[PDB]
Ligand binder design. Structure first.
Ligand SMILES: [Mg+2]
Ligand SMILES: [Mg+2]
Ligand SMILES: [Mg+2]
Ligand SMILES: [Mg+2]
Ligand SMILES: [Mg+2]
Ligand SMILES: [Mg+2]
Ligand SMILES: [Mg+2]
Ligand SMILES: [Mg+2]
Ligand SMILES: [Mg+2]
Ligand SMILES: [Mg+2]
Ligand SMILES: [Mg+2]
Ligand SMILES: [Mg+2]
Ligand SMILES: [Mg+2]
Ligand SMILES: [Mg+2]
Ligand SMILES: [Mg+2]
Ligand SMILES: [Mg+2]
Lengths: 175, 122, 72, 49
RNA sequence: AGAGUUAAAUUAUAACUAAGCUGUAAAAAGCCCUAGUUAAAAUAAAAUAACCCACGAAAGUGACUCUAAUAAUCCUGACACACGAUAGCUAGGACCCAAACUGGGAUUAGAUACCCCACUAUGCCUAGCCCUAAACCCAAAUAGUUACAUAACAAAACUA
């Protein structure tokens, strides 16, 4: 988790001349201290888009959109941790995650170098969709578990039988 | 100006009022607030009878406090004013001077609505 | 007009609900039976698998849970 | 402009020093927010009483 | 979604005063630990504004305040994912008032109804389920056109 420090002097007032000469109080009113949450999101967005990107000027580029959407997503995460039962924001979160991923799968298919970088930097991990979405239910889950255990047994038994064969034939061939 | 504190104080004499205002503002500056101004709308008969702190009140002093504060803290101040027995009733509103007036360009007259029904001849 | 259709269904449904009330514990019995049957066919399906794979006993530590007979 | 404006307004804020003075000051000076309108779109103010 | 708050009613509960009060097309039963006035927490529900037509994906949302907040540089898309009115279930808390059920009173040939009185599950809060509605604006989503052109009725006709 990052920490856009309380004193950080909101985005719009950072580049106005001679700000640092002003007395403590006004500096304080322009701080992230007296700020909204939306100001901390503006800051977080700028900072991320500077760490991660190449051309922070292009809003249009896929990568840019992915970074922005990722800020929004981390924010819904926070909100959802506080309000467990808000179903509306759960919707925004899951939805907006799917949009991120759609865009990622679109990067990977077009500019791969960048996609690689982004996944590393935002810690997103890109999984390929499965073929066959099916609901794993009690019967199937159990049966499959069994079939897997059966398999592991059988091939272990073939291994033991081949150990016995090798030992027998070797101790025979020697004398 | 960011928040507006509407204070309705129990109606009292000079010194005690002054005291209540002082301790109130202090509490505000301790929750991290910066106080812009202090306005006094006078003491009046309350519009209806207000029951607070085992007292049924008729009159009250009225004050506004404009101040900037970190978003987190409104709940805190609110808690504080709640348990002060000298406050008849507290409220904290987003300061009305933050919202700015868009321009009514005028009243766009709405024409009667057409084609709600087909051209059928009854 | 259309209600004639609705009315029909209405009646059907009523009569059926009524019937489920009368026939209730008969129905209970039959459904419990079908659940046992289900569990069994399941077990057979599993047994069949580990046997056609040449094993004799079921693989180590295999209890074959009761899924359908799951307490209501 | 905004930063300069606030720079000005900051001279006037209430502080640990001004508390005593300012409070006693405000207790002296009642203000009204009241005014009425006329069918014409005109403002009418009470202080002429 | 959270947290905080309450104007109008209503009620526990006393204080006076009156013998009745309630109730219907009309009565009865009920109550007189009742009624009118004066005082009043809790709970629940949110006149007027609204002759407005906003927000939300839909279900839904119209007392007040603050915090958080309303995906996508915006095509379609599931049986996958996440939601989903009322009713209903589990557990704990609430209970003004309403009320299936039930018990009384009428009504009636009967009345396991409509009407009257009481009262319960339930409506509320917390947590989990349940996944249904005439969930219907009975009109699929996204772009468009007003050309051709009336089965009937309805909310005019059509293209991709
Ligand atoms: Mg039939
Ligand atoms: Mg009670
Ligand atoms: Mg009688
Ligand atoms: Mg209201
Ligand atoms: Mg949107
Ligand atoms: Mg789609
Ligand atoms: Mg539901
Ligand atoms: Mg319920
Ligand atoms: Mg319960
Ligand atoms: Mg009850
Ligand atoms: Mg009743
Ligand atoms: Mg009866
Ligand atoms: Mg809640
Ligand atoms: Mg509906
Ligand atoms: Mg349909
Ligand atoms: Mg569709």
């Amino acid at each position: 988790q990052d920490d856009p420090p309380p004193s950080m002097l909101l985005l719009d007032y950072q580049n106005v001349p001679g700000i640092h000469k002003v007395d403590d109080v006004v500096k304080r009113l322009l701080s992230l201290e007296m700020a909204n949450q939306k100001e901390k999101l503006k800051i977080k967005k700028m900072q991320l888009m500077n760490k991660v990107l190449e051309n922070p000027e292009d809003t249009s580029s896929l990568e840019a959109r992915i970074v922005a959407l990722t800020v929004k997503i981390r924010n819904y995460e926070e909100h959802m941790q506080k309000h467990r039962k808000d179903k509306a924001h759960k919707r925004f979160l899951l939805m907006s995650i799917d949009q991120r991923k759609k865009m990622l799968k679109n990067l990977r298919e077009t500019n791969y170098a960048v996609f690689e970088k982004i996944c590393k930097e935002l810690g997103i991990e890109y999984t390929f969709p499965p073929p066959y979405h099916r609901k794993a239910h009690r019967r199937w889950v159990t049966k499959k578990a069994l079939c897997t255990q059966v398999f592991r047994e059988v091939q272990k038994l073939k291994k033991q039988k081949r150990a016995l064969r090798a030992a027998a034939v070797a101790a025979h061939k020697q004398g | 100006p960011r928040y507006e504190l509407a204070l309705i104080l129990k109606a009292m004499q000079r010194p005690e009022t002054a005291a209540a205002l002082k301790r109130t503002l202090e509490a505000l500056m301790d929750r991290g607030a910066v106080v812009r101004n202090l306005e006094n709308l006078g003491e009046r008969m309350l519009p209806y009878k207000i029951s607070a702190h085992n007292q049924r009140h008729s009159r009250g002093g009225y004050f506004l406090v404009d101040f900037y504060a970190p978003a987190t803290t409104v709940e805190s101040m609110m808690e504080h004013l709640s348990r002060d027995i000298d406050v008849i009733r507290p409220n904290i509103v987003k300061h009305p001077l933050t919202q700015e007036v868009k321009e009514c360009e005028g009243i766009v007259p709405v024409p009667l609505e057409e084609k709600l029904y087909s051209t059928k001849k009854r | 007009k259309n209600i004639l259709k609705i009315r029909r269904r209405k009646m059907n449904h009523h009569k059926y609900r009524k019937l489920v009330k009368r026939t209730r514990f008969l129905r209970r019995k039959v459904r419990e039976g079908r659940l046992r049957q289900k569990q069994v066919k399941f077990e057979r399906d599993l047994k069949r698998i580990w046997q056609k794979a040449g094993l004799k006993e079921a693989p180590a530590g295999w209890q074959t849970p009761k899924i359908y007979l799951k307490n209501q | 402009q905004e930063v300069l404006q606030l720079q000005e307004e900051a001279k006037t804020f209430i502080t640990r020093e001004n508390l005593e003075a300012r409070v006693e000051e405000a207790l002296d000076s009642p203000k009204s927010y009241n005014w009425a309108i006329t069918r014409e779109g005109l403002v009418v103010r009470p202080q002429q009483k």
